[PDB]
Design a protein around this nucleic acid. Structure first.
Ligand SMILES: NCCSC[C@H]1O[C@@H](n2cnc3c(N)ncnc32)[C@H](O)[C@@H]1O
Length: 393
DNA sequence: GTTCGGTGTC
DNA sequence: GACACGAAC
């Protein structure tokens, strides 16, 4: 799947290898990265491409092509430079996930990768594999989704990279015309330590990196675009997660099998609410977006907290904070559900106002840009709340 | 329990 | 661009 030439050129500009060095393109198909590196830096390297699909492998005679699953491949010797664009996707059942392998193959991947966590992703596994294949002081330059900067599934991967060498992350954003993904380039070197975060600007002449921040003692913490303002706001109030237990809605299959739940409206039945029912500062209790209906009073059988009016915050409205007080205490199939901790005093209307405020939207957009199409728990629990809105006694 | 999206669908 | 679900663990 194609990489824009300006992305390739940018990545090649970050790449290096010594004379006679071993240069690898994993998932290479026709080897556009090998070709670009050779054109830019010359011929005195050992070029290798690894590709699983015989129909796809189409390298020039000056490169060695290997037909293999890169994730399970064991070469005789490590590499000086590894570059390219790995495949992206979750391994799982075809009805829901795009990568389809025998369970036994998924088992080999889990055995192979110390960073594998949750559903994980091929791109995480490619990154780990590549790092393991680098000689000491070797370099990797990959373009991958930005999701690993922030997501829990990638916590082990971030800790692994922090531990194994030094990391530079260059934000590109949505640079693939046909693909819905916000991208970064990672340049990793198997020596030293620390993280450098870079923005980019694109011009006619390609991408130009702009240094944003440096974290010389990075240990795999979530990566964010921090500013003087984000810092200033964070120290102005209690993290939201110190004021509230944060829970998630019961999931669709739990409602679908529950004997109280119906697929048609009826006397005494209310809609099972989704994200579409959640608006800034109010809840649309009437419209049904889930296809599911149930008695309001039986909602507590799915989660005890559905019995109690409480704060609800959106998960799938992009990088935004959208909140409302569920005054009626309805069943929800989506969103975060925040229950105040013992001793917490709240002004719900004011807090909802603050969460929905322009200041709050700019805060989260600065920090997290468009890495993921969600406000995640790790973002939400860090939102700052001053004494006007909430107070822990 | 709750996570994630070479997103899904308008 | 608007505006957002179940297999996975
Ligand atoms: N480098 C372009 C994006 S990734 C798409 C390419 O990766 C190949 N590919 C996918 N999974 C692979 C794997 N595990 N090992 C080697 N090649 C793989 C595909 O056949 C395809 O040519």
């Amino acid at each position: 799947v194609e990489t824009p030439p300006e992305v390739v050129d940018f990545m090649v500009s970050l790449a290096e290898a010594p004379r006679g060095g071993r240069v690898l393109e994993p998932a290479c198909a026709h080897g556009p990265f090998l070709r670009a590196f050779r054109e830019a830096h010359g011929t005195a390297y050992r070029f290798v491409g690894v590709e699983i699909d015989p129909k796809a492998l189409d390298l020039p005679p000056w490169a060695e092509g290997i037909l293999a699953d890169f994730l399970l491949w064991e070469p005789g010797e490590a590499f000086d430079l590894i570059l390219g664009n790995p495949p992206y996707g979750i391994v799982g059942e075809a009805s829901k996930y795009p990568i389809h392998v025998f369970k036994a193959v998924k088992d080999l991947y889990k055995k192979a990768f110390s960073t594998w966590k949750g559903k994980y992703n091929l791109y995480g596994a490619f990154l780990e594999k590549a790092v393991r294949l680098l000689k000491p002081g070797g370099v990797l330059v990959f373009v991958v989704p930005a999701t690993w900067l922030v997501l829990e599934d990638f916590a082990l991967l971030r800790e692994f990279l922090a531990r194994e060498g030094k990391t530079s992350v260059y934000y590109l954003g949505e640079v693939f015309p046909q693909k819905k993904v916000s991208a970064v380039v990672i340049r990793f070197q198997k020596s030293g330590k620390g993280l450098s975060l870079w923005d980019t600007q694109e011009s006619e002449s390609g991408f130009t990196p702009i240094l944003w921040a440096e974290y010389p003692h990075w240990e795999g913490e979530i990566i964010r675009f921090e500013t003087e303002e984000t810092r200033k706001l964070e120290i102005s109030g209690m993290p939201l997660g110190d004021l509230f237990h944060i829970r998630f809605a019961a999931r669709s299959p739990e409602f679908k099998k529950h004997p109280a739940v119906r697929k048609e409206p009826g006397p005494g039945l209310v809609p099972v609410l989704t994200g579409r029912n959640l608006k800034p500062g109010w809840v649309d209790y009437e419209k049904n977006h889930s296809g599911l209906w149930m008695p309001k009073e039986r909602a507590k059988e799915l989660r005890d907290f559905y019995a109690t009016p409480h704060l609800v915050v959106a998960h799938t409205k992009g990088t935004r904070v959208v909140a409302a007080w569920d005054e009626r205490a309805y069943p929800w199939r989506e969103e975060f559900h925040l229950l105040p901790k013992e001793g917490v005093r709240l002004d719900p209307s004011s807090l909802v106002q603050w969460l929905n405020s322009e200041a709050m939207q700019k805060h989260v957009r600065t920090l997290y840009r468009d890495f993921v199409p969600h406000l995640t728990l790790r973002m939400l629990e860090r939102l700052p709340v001053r004494r006007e809105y909430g107070f822990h006694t």
